[PDB]
Design a protein around this ligand. Structure first.
Ligand code: DDF
Length: 159
């Protein structure tokens, strides 16, 4: 089963860690818990963004160029990447944008963290149609000593 997971700002905006103005450790705990022990697909750009494989997960890089690092699995296409995952109950798509887009059509689920924050950014999560997706989980949290901003966890499943 294909899954997508992300953190969005005002208006479906998404960006890198350092590109990000917020600071929510709870969001990372949430991401960790939901990607741990599962394969994770990502584009090159996010790979480079992270800089080290994510521990506890098979890291697969969807990229068009030959990879320059033995610590992860390099894939050249959507089908390649899914096969590299072999038989697992859930595959997680971690981005970025093109990535997100290319898989949403395959996705059956969505883990999203809505962040209460306006920010200027080059990219956006794909415009997905809410009549098509059912919200099965939701949990709002005020900002705290830990978390800079207010955020909301939500999990949708394709009806
Ligand atoms: N919910 C959600 N929030 C996010 O911020 C992102 C997504 N999804 N999906 C895509 C994306 C990828 C960026 C990204 C950057 C760093 C780490 C990272 O260090 N993860 C550690 C967290 C450290 C900790 O959990 O204390 C991990 O082991 O998963 C993960 C993802 C960022």
């Amino acid at each position: 089963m294909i899954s997508l997971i992300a953190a969005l700002a005002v208006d479906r905006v998404i960006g890198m860690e350092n590109a990000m103005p917020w600071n929510l450790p709870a969001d990372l705990a949430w991401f960790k818990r939901n990607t741990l022990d599962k394969p994770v697909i990502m584009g090159r750009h996010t790979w480079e963004s992270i800089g080290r494989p994510l521990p506890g997960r098979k890291n697969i890089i969807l990229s068009s160029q030959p990879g320059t690092d033995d610590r992860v699995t390099w894939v050249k296409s959507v089908d390649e990447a899914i096969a590299a995952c072999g038989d697992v109950p859930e595959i997680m798509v971690i981005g970025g944008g093109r990535v997100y887009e290319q898989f949403l059509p395959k996705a059956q689920k969505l883990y999203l963290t809505h962040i209460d924050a306006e920010v200027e950014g080059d990219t956006h999560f794909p415009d997905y149609e809410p009549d098509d997706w059912e919200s099965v989980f939701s949990e709002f949290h005020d900002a705290d000593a830990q978390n800079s901003h207010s955020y909301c966890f939500e999990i949708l499943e394709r009806r």
